[PDB]
Design a binder for this molecule. Structure first.
Ligand SMILES: [Zn+2]
Ligand SMILES: [Zn+2]
Length: 356
């Protein structure tokens, strides 16, 4: 994984808050996933804040979701939200020496989960882009204005990028539109059969499924059952598509025993029936599917009442190549070395997409 520090601007820490990141002169959070929040509520950091003034920068939506959780509220006076595509000047103060450094940061949508951004940094040590976690369609980098000067791609020294699926194995992954379309039609065909036909969307406990929930709710006029929606209380574009009311045909609720429940025709929220009549439940499990270069269906049946539906939080190998090729940075560094590859193989895929 990425240890928080870009070589070009090492006095700021991104998506990593422990060890050497404890001495950072400014903090950045790309998005509100635990993989990118290590040490963020470490007592040693709660104290290092109080002893003097360092800030955490992030998207307005990221600030809302972060400050919703009780454990992070100590950040409240120390978070500065930056609007999307708004170049902003930040002052970095060396505590020991009193030296001031000036950097500009620009937040670009990363298409990962709500509030997820890339950080574009400009200053004395070159231009660098930290992608965080990102899913962008092929051709999307050419349509980002603030990666351009006078219709020309900006001169970028280093791109630090989401290499979750950086291998030709994950050559092609269906778009979020194709994924949504597949889920929409499976759900539609099921819940229109009668009022006792309900869907359980088996989703991990992590932001990034809302796009699914909000679009199912618009097209079908049915709110999605969730354990908690208070994180979205000041976000009407999401909130109004969700409910804590169990009386709905679409559930994204969660329970430790959800699997044994489903076996007994019980939703995680513990209902088996409506007006004494047992419900008809299908499970749909969003899960990453991929296709090799020289090798179909986003919906896979797994049982009489169970389905896997293609869904990805990270770009395909093809989408990585497209993004990085277009930017043609001097350097490209992987934010992650997945379990099934190595630094040398990922560098071997990245180096040819760089300048020279
Ligand atoms: Zn993530
Ligand atoms: Zn439920």
């Amino acid at each position: 994984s990425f240890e928080g520090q870009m070589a070009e601007y090492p006095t700021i820490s991104i998506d990593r808050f422990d060890r050497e990141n404890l001495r950072a002169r400014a903090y950045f959070l790309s998005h509100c996933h635990k993989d990118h929040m290590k040490g963020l509520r470490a007592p040693t950091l709660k104290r290092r804040l109080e002893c003097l003034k360092v800030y955490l920068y992030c998207s307005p939506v990221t600030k809302e979701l972060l400050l919703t959780s009780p454990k992070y509220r100590f950040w409240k006076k120390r978070i500065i939200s930056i609007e999307i595509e708004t170049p902003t000047q930040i002052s970095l103060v060396d505590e020991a020496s009193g030296e001031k450094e000036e950097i500009v940061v620009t937040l670009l949508p990363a298409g990962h989960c709500p509030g997820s951004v890339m950080f574009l940094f400009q200053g004395n040590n070159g231009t660098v882009l930290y992608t965080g976690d990102f899913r962008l369609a092929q051709g999307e980098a050419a349509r980002m204005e603030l990666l351009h000067s006078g219709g020309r791609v900006k001169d970028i020294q280093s791109v630090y990028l989401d290499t979750t699926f950086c291998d030709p194995r994950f050559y092609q992954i269906p778009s979020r539109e194709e994924c949504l379309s597949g889920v929409l039609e499976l759900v539609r065909s099921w819940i229109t059969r009668s009022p006792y036909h309900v869907v359980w969307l088996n989703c991990k406990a992590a932001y990034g499924y809302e796009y699914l929930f909000t679009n199912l709710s618009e097209e079908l006029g049915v709110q999605v059952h969730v354990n908690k929606l208070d994180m979205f209380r000041n976000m009407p574009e999401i909130l109004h598509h969700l409910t804590t009311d169990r009386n709905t045909q679409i559930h994204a609720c969660r329970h430790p025993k959800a699997e044994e429940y489903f076996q007994w025709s019980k939703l995680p929220c513990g209902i088996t029936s409506r007006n004494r009549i047992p419900l008809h439940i299908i499970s749909i499990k969003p899960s990453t599917m991929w296709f090799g270069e020289r090798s179909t269906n986003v919906i896979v049946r797994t049982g009489e009442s169970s389905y896997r539906a293609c869904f990805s939080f990270h770009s395909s190998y093809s989408e990585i190549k497209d993004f990085l090729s277009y930017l043609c940075p001097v350097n490209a560094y992987p934010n992650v070395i997945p379990v099934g590859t190595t630094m040398d193989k990922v560098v071997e895929i990245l180096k040819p997409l760089c300048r020279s």
